[PDB]
Structure formats: C-alpha cells, structure tokens
A paper describes a structure:
We have discovered a new cluster of genes that is found exclusively in the Actinobacteria phylum. First, based on the co-occurence of a putative 2-AP 1,6-dioxygenase, which is suggested to catalyze the benzene ring cleavage of 2-AP (herein referred to as ARO dioxygenase), with shell proteins, the ARO BMC is the first metabolosome predicted to be involved in the degradation of aromatic substrates.
To structurally and functionally characterize the ARO dioxygenase and to demonstrate its ability to degrade 2-AP, we recombinantly co-expressed and purified the alpha and a His-tagged beta subunit (ARO AmnA and AmnB) from Micromonospora rosaria. The co-elution of the subunits and the observation that neither of the subunits was soluble when expressed on their own, suggest a requirement for an interaction between the two subunits during folding. This interaction was verified by size exclusion chromatography analysis, which yielded a major peak at 140 kDa, corresponding to a tetramer composed of two heterodimers, as observed for other dioxygenases. Two alpha/beta heterodimers form a biological dimer via their beta subunits, consistent with our size exclusion analysis, and we find two of those in the asymmetric unit of the P1 unit cell. However, one large difference between the ARO BMC-associated dioxygenase and its non-BMC-associated counterpart is in a loop close to the active site for the beta subunit involving residues N184-Y188 (orange). A consequence of the difference is a much more shielded active site as seen in the surface representation.
Author numbering:
A (entry chain A): 4 to 278
B (entry chain B): 31 to 322
C (entry chain D): 30 to 321
D (entry chain C): 4 to 277
The structure:
C-alpha cells in the first residue's frame, strides 16, 4: 500500500533513558522500544515526524539537513545522566522538499531549514534512541507551530500524507508529545513521581479511552478543553497534526501510560500489530 | 548607595543583532530597525561610561527552566547560538565570562527565600539566543562579567510566569549583589506587546512592512510606557499584569518584574531610550536608576 | 570659539505632532499618536530650556512661501488663529508670542547687505504660517522665549528646490546679526526628510498601525543622511543634502537645514539624532548640532 | 439647459486690484469684470470654482462654510495696497455636498471643510471682487490637489458637472490660475513689469492660440511640456479640471493677456457672449 500506513504517539522527555528510571518511565520506554520494533518491521520508506519541543511561531519549518549528529546536553536536565544525549539522525530531505512544496501550494509559508549548529530538540533525540537505536529509519520533520491555529498544523499534516502518496512511498507518522503538563516544581526522586495536579489524570484517561475506541474526532472536539484544564502539551496540537496526516485511523493501541515528573505520558500506536 | 546601579528593559529580537552586522553573527543584513539600534548605542554608552558595573545580570524568557530558577555558573560559556525560528537572522558565536561567585550567591539567596533553584556548571549546555542577543546589545565587547538567569516557566504549556516568584528572585539578586560587594547593571530582556506577523516579508529588513501589529497593542504599550516615564515604579506592580492581559506582552516572562523588584521598586521614572516595532511587536529600551 | 548661536536644530513641523500632544492652544483633540517623535521633542525642549537657555529662537520654515526674496517677521507681538489648510481637523492653533524685533531688523539688514532681496514684515494683520507655529510650539510650548520668524523664498505657483546657495547667504546674515547684537540664539530649521506621503488619510489619523515608511527606498535614503549626520562633520552634508533631495523629494529642499548649518559655520561636529519616525509616510528627524 | 453651460479662466494675483496698476494688470482686471457681467447675466444657479492658491496634497477638500467673510492681508504683498483684501463669499454648501458625495462614490477621498478661521486664498478673494462685487453668485469650491495625478482633478470636475445636471442646476465653471510662473524675484515698479523668463511668453501665446481655436485637447496633450518649460501655475491642472467639467467646449474668447510680476496671465471664457 502507498501513503500513510501507520501512526504512533510517544512522549519525548529524556527521563525515559534514565539509568535509574521510575517504574513509569521504564514502562513508557519499554513500550516505545516495542513500537519502534513494530515500526521498523513495517519498513516504511519515510516516517513523517512532529515533536512539540521543536516549536515555531513563524510559518512551518522543515528539517533539510540530511544528517544532524553530535551530542546534546539538555537545557533542563543537564544535571542528570539522561541530560547527556548522543544523536545521529537521517532525514529524507528530498521527500521533505515535496512536502514543503505541497505546504506552500496550500497558501502557507514553508521554510527550509539547513543550518550548521541548528538546535536539535530533546524529544526528537529521545524518540530516535527508543524507536531506532541503529538509525535505520529515514525521517521527514516539520516544526510545531504554536502561534497559528491548531487546524493549520492539521493542514500541514494533510499535505504530508498527500505528498507521501504522490511520491509512492510507504510512510508512517510519529508525533512526540506529552499529555497533561502538570510539572512538579521540586527535585524529586525517581520513586516519588505522580501526575502533578488535580484532574490531569482523569483528563488523560478520558482522552486515552476515546482514542482506544477509535473516537478521534471526539478528542479533537474537546481538544481545547483538554488543553485548558489539563495544560496538554502544546494544546495537544500534535494530535491534530497526526489526524490531519491520516495516521490516527482505527482503534489506538495503548502500550503504556504514566507520569514523568508530573506530566502525563502515553505510548500509542495505530495500525501497528505485532505481525 | 545600592549595589545595583541601574536596571534596564533590554529586548532581544534577533532582528536587532541582524541589522547591526556584528562580526560574531554569521548572517548579513542591509540594515534595519535603525532607531532601536541607535537607542541601544545610547544604552551601551551609559553602561560603559557612567554605570561602569562589575557584572551584567540578565534575565531572559527563552532559557525556560521547567523546575525552578537556574543560574548559569559556567566560568567561560562559549558556543554557537542559532535562533531556531529566525536562523537566517541570528547565528552568533559567543564567548564571555561568568561571575561565578555572584551566580552561586544568587542561587543561595533564592533558595534561602524559598525558591526551587539549581546551579548550572556543565559547559556543554548551549546558552540561549535571547540571553546572547540581550548581552550583545548591552555590551558588544563582552568585557564585563555576566550572570545569566533562567526563566521559570512551562515549555510544554507556556503561561504567565509567577510574578511573585520573580519578585522573590529579584530580592535574592539584590541580597547576593549586596553580600558580594558587586556593582551591577540588570538586563530584563522582554519585549512589550508580543503579537507578530505570521508571514515574514520577502526582505526581512523592509521597513515599510514594519509597524505596530494594530493600534490596540500600540496604545497599550503607550499606556505602560507613559506610566514608566512619569510616576514611580510601585504602580507598575499592577499595571504590568494588566498590560500582559491586553497585549500578550513578553513581560509575562517576568524579567521586568524581577529587575524592578531587585531595585526595590524605586520611586523614580524610567528613561525610555527608544520604542519601535519588530515584526509588529512592541519593543522599548528603558533605563531605571536608584532613588537619588 | 563661543558663537552666539549656541545650538541648531532640525525641527520638523507636521501638524500631527501638535495634534497628538493636545496642547491648550490647539482646538482639535486626538487620542495620542506619534509618541516616540513627541517624546524626542520633549528631550529637545529640555535641552533648550535647561541647557541652551537662549535669548531668542530663530526659525526658518518652508510654507510661508514668499515669491520675492526673503522676509523677516518684525511684528512685535504676533497673535491669531493658525489653521492648517490641508489638516484643519488636526491643527487650529491660537498663537501669541513676542518677536526680537531688533534681531529681526539686523538679520534683514545683514541679508540685504549680502545681496539678498529682503523685506521686513510689520503688518500685524498678516497670519503667521502653520509650520512656523508648529515648529515653535514643539521647540518651546511655553512661548516664553523671543522669536524671529524667517520666510522661505520659493515659487507658490511652481514649487521648486530653493536655491541652496542663497540659503547659505541667509545663514551667514543670521550669524552676523546674532554676533553683532550679542544675542544667544537657538536656530530651528523646520524641514522634514523624505516627503512622499499617503494619498488617503486613515479613518483614524493617529492609527499607528497605518504609520510606517512610504517605502524602503525613502527610508534607506533618510538613514544614509542620518548616519552621515551622526558620524562625520557637517560640511560634507552640503553635498549630501542635494542628493537626498533628488532621491526622496525631501522637504530639506526648502533650504532651512542648509541655512542653519551655514549659520553655525558648518561646525566639525556630529549631530545628535534625538529621534526619527514617520508621519503619514514622510521621514521626520529631530536633530541637535552644537558648536565645536 | 442644465449642467455646466459656461466656463471662464482668470488669474488670481492681487495685482489686478492695484490702485496704481501696470497697463497689463488693469487690462486683465477690466477683462475679469467683463467676464463677471457676462457670467451674472447668464444667471447661473451655482458656479463651480477651483483656485490654484487653495491647494491640497491629501484628497479633495470642499468648502462647506456657507459664508466665509472678513479681511485678509496677503502674506507676500502686504506692503502694497492690493495686499489688503476684504471678502464676503457665499457657498452653496448643499450642492457642494452632492458634488462631494459623487467624488466619494468615485473612490476618491472627498473631505468636507467647515472650520472657523479656515484660510481663504487670495485668488478666490480677487476673483470674487472682480466677477461679483455685489456678492450675488453662489460658489461651490474644491481644492486644487497638487500631489495626485492631474487627471484625478479632471475626474473631480466631471463629477461636479454630473452633480449639477442631476440637481437640475444651470451652472458655470470658473478656474483661477496663472499661466507661466516665471516670477520676477525683485521689488519692481509697475512700469517695468515684463514676462519673467525666455520662452514663457511664446509658450503662453501658443496655448492661447490653441484654446481660441477650440483645441483644448492639444493643450492637454502638451500640458506637461508647458508645465516643465514655462513653469505653468500648478502644471496648468486647472485647465484639466475645467475640461473634465465639460466647461471648455467650443472656441475660447481671449479677453486679455499680459504679465503680472513676471508671470503670464490671461482672462478666457467659453460660451459667454455679449
Ligand atoms: Fe523573545
Ligand atoms: Fe511641511
């Protein structure tokens, strides 16, 4: 089959790679690694990618450096072992060109990004380490515009799925996002993690129940509520992008759910069986 | 006489560095935003020729620390700072010295006042583009020790910073400056009204395309600035949140509040060295001095 | 030396600046507007009041277009209502000020002695032009300094570039008179820069979203002139002023800037650009020059 | 017959009212009074008016004060007897409103002007004194925009003629303009007045010959050359206004031509007999 054929959603905080992880971090990390094995078994030509931690407020930026690599010390977690992250990413910059072109054809400002020293976000590095330790996948990444409407990001998602079809690619979509963002303002130990604020846990589970039942358009109808009351990562526009990219079809398989330093975190997949 | 000899509102949009074509910045412009850059030249001379500080303490919004308030105590930060949203405007090679003793004192005082804090000592962490831009505009010679403070906020759900915690951090900064005998100038690097173009003009520095986002944002900026240039700073304590609510001001990051609190809310007027717009956002360069 | 002319200023007169201030003498009322330029004028006002402390303000403006030579207003106490014919909704100004008649008579005498066609106006029924009133209000709204108003030699039926050579003669005539009479004077050259403007007024005149450079070409040329003003001496401006007129239709074609710089002896000094901004698209700069 | 039925062009410099005029000033003044008597005999309901000395650079301003009156001292000729000028003018402000509405409907900025102390230009004052000493005409006046294209003023004139027809008015058009503007930059005596510059007198007679021959178009075609080479008052856009108002039809009658302090000046009329 051509086009977008699989989808996955996973958290992106570096705690998933901790040497001494909280039980929830190791469960989320293990689920992510499982999703990665399934994704690589699908053998997609390209994986469209959006991580909330590469954000923008001006147009839609696309990663056009074919091979960013190096070491990244996260600006927040430098003091922990999981704050030091190595990365070596391969981007299909030519499919990215087709996708950026489709976005410009839709009236949006597509911005090619190829600069030495351009910052690489922690979410993308963590996702590569969990889903693709051997760097087999070829990514196509767009920024997460926080300024324009969430539906414009859905439009960019629709443009990506159309480009994948025009290019004859077997592609998947991966979005790196948290759920509720109730961060614990303390230097906690791994054993004392928890959902951070009242009502956040119920909100995450409500959203997760709807997605596991294939009721995606109903999470999108309540997205703004989820964002306001549970401080969902980037107003959960990562889901709007994934839905736009035809990636969230059918029932969602919940692989794991738990807290990361107060935030809500879940590993989900669409159309990613074990076989 | 207070150890903090001046506090400045020192916005950091990369367009201002881009327009100056400094050696440290890789991209090159044909100019732009001249009046704001000339106002900064005035501030630079004030810092260099009048205040003569032992240290520049800068608080900016883009080093967002999700847990508490961090202090950069790296002795000699160096690296390449690329502005992710405007990489065509700002790719800055930086190299400066930190007043480690002061930064450690600030962290110590802030924790003593009840804030969650951390001292950054890993030189592999890249300094954020807003801190670099602010420091370049205040002193492009980089020959004054620096203490860089992070901005407490939520990077996954950006919100109005806790202005109360920023007042606490300001007191922590004053205590540390006094305890260490330093002569300091503070840099609160926030823009004002923060709604901007969703499309960049074909030529970034096309000044025909540079104007207020709308008159509502402009008039609210003017209301804040009029209060600044006239009465004491104490009323700004309530006007700042009001202006934030009406304009989405970048002062919601809290740097302006931090600095004014550090100065003890002096009963003085601010000297508005310049105001202009950058992709529609309001930008004011202001200097406050202690009473007397 | 210690010249009689203690300062010379480029002091543009667009009625929007008076309108935005809402002074008591002006009938129409605004909601603000053009704040940064008005704030710059406040700085110039304090420079005149608190530092220069002149005996007389000598102003030259373009719109009193006298078609036969150069006229000097020697009316002892000009008073009346000044209505801007193109912007009557912005500027209807009730003026009342005192003239330094002796200096005015000496300026005209020195001017005729240098070969200029001159005339002394003594009829109090003649209305002082709206640009002279605007310039003087912006330079000193207290009207407590004697004045000498000079007219602008041009053709009211086929407007052209004023003979800049003639204006240099008028400048020397002005210098000779100030020295001969022992006056301490501040000169006001009331010209805007680039002078292409909107063909249509915005619904709200002070809607600052609609206030921006006519185009980037006009802006860049203003910047070229201002940067030369900010660095090198003034004598090279003699050659740059005509080029900037040809490129932007600058109001400096009226010759007031040339007159003032020549009256100051083309001092080997930089100009202090207190402020630059646009008014219905035209370039407007407030600048102060001081003796060597 | 409704609409614009007559037209006239006269100079506006106050020298026409001099107590001790040069022969040319007097001839032009008498020519103006002649046109005035012919105009008032025509009994127009309203006279559309454009004077080059009420100029603008922003939209098109209309005189909406029904009765400006007072005494005016010219800022250039105050020292001479003709620099003191009294005026009492009546404007048909309601027709002016219709005219302004038509200009606004045409996509142009029509600006209604009614303010105490608004300056009244010397050209309009001189024209009223010569054409209408008893203040019996009712004027409708628009500014002379110098910044917009000259053809925008032709559109304003066309709108005024259309409005007069819609209102059922019998109207005339008067334009107050100089010709060449090579002014003598010297305090001369009346006896030594002369066209100021070379080529100005030849350029003036050239357009007058065409106008008297009913060739207004060929004047409009060379209007820009006339403006550049002879410094024609306001690029002679006053003629573009009159032509747009359909007031310059048929042969023009040349009542007088001569210099005024170096400038060229002429009194012309279209369809004003007797
Ligand atoms: Fe910023
Ligand atoms: Fe002017």
């Amino acid at each position: 089959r051509t086009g977008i054929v699989a989808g996955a959603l996973l958290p992106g905080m570096p705690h998933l790679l901790a040497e001494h992880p909280a039980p929830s971090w190791s469960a989320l990390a293990g689920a992510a690694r499982d999703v990665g094995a399934r994704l690589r078994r699908l053998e997609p030509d390209v994986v469209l990618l959006l991580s909330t931690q590469w954000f923008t407020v001006l147009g839609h930026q696309f990663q056009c450096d074919p091979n960013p690599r190096g070491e990244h010390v996260d600006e927040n977690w430098y003091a922990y072992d999981y704050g030091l992250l190595d990365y070596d990413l391969r981007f299909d910059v030519d499919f990215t060109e087709r996708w950026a072109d489709r976005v410009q054809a839709g009236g949006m400002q597509a911005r090619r990004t190829r600069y030495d020293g351009f910052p690489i976000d922690t979410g993308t590095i963590v996702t590569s380490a969990l889903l693709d330790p051997d760097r087999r996948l070829r990514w196509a990444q767009v920024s997460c515009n926080l300024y324009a409407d969430a539906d414009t990001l859905a439009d960019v998602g629709r443009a990506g799925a159309a480009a994948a079809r025009d290019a004859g690619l077997r592609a998947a979509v991966v979005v790196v996002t948290g759920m509720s963002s109730g961060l614990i303002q303390q230097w906690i130990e791994p054993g004392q993690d928890r959902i951070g604020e009242p009502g956040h846990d119920q909100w995450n589970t409500r959203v997760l129940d709807l997605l596991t039942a294939g009721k995606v358009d109903e999470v999108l109808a309540v997205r703004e509520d989820f964002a306001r009351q549970a401080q969902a990562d980037s107003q959960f526009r990562a889901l709007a992008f994934a839905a736009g990219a035809e990636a969230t079809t059918g029932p969602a398989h919940l692989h794991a759910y738990g807290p990361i330093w107060g935030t809500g975190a879940a590993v989900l997949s669409w159309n990613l069986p074990d076989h | 006489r207070p150890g903090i000899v001046a506090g400045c509102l020192s916005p950091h949009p990369p367009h201002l560095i881009y327009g100056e074509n400094p050696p440290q910045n890789e991209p090159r412009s044909t100019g732009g935003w001249e009046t704001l850059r000339w106002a900064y030249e005035r501030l630079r001379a004030r810092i260099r020729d009048v205040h003569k500080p032992d240290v520049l303490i800068v608080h900016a919004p883009h080093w967002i620390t999700m847990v508490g308030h961090h202090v950069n105590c790296v002795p000699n930060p160096r690296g390449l700072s690329v502005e992710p949203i405007f990489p065509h405007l700002f790719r800055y090679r930086y190299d400066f010295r930190t007043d480690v003793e002061l930064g450690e004192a600030i962290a110590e005082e802030a924790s003593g006042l009840g804030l969650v804090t951390r001292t950054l000592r890993d030189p592999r962490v890249r300094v954020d583009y807003a801190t670099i831009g602010a420091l370049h505009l205040a002193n492009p010679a980089w020959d004054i020790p620096v203490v860089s403070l992070s901005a407490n906020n939520n990077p996954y759900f950006y919100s109005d910073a806790s202005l109360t915690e920023m007042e606490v951090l300001g007191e922590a900064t004053r205590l540390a400056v006094e305890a260490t005998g330093r002569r300091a100038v503070l840099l609160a690097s926030n823009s004002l009204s923060h709604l901007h173009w969703h499309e960049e003009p074909e030529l970034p520095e096309d000044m025909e395309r540079e104007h207020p986002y709308n008159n509502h944002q402009y008039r609210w900026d003017m209301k804040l600035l009029e209060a600044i240039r006239r009465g004491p700073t104490a009323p700004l304590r309530d006007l700042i949140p009001e202006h934030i609510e009406a304009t989405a001001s970048e002062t919601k990051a809290g740097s302006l509040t931090w600095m004014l609190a550090a100065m003890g809310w002096p009963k003085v007027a601010g000297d508005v060295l310049g105001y202009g717009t950058i992709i529609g956002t309001g930008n004011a360069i202001v200097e406050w001095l202690p009473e007397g």
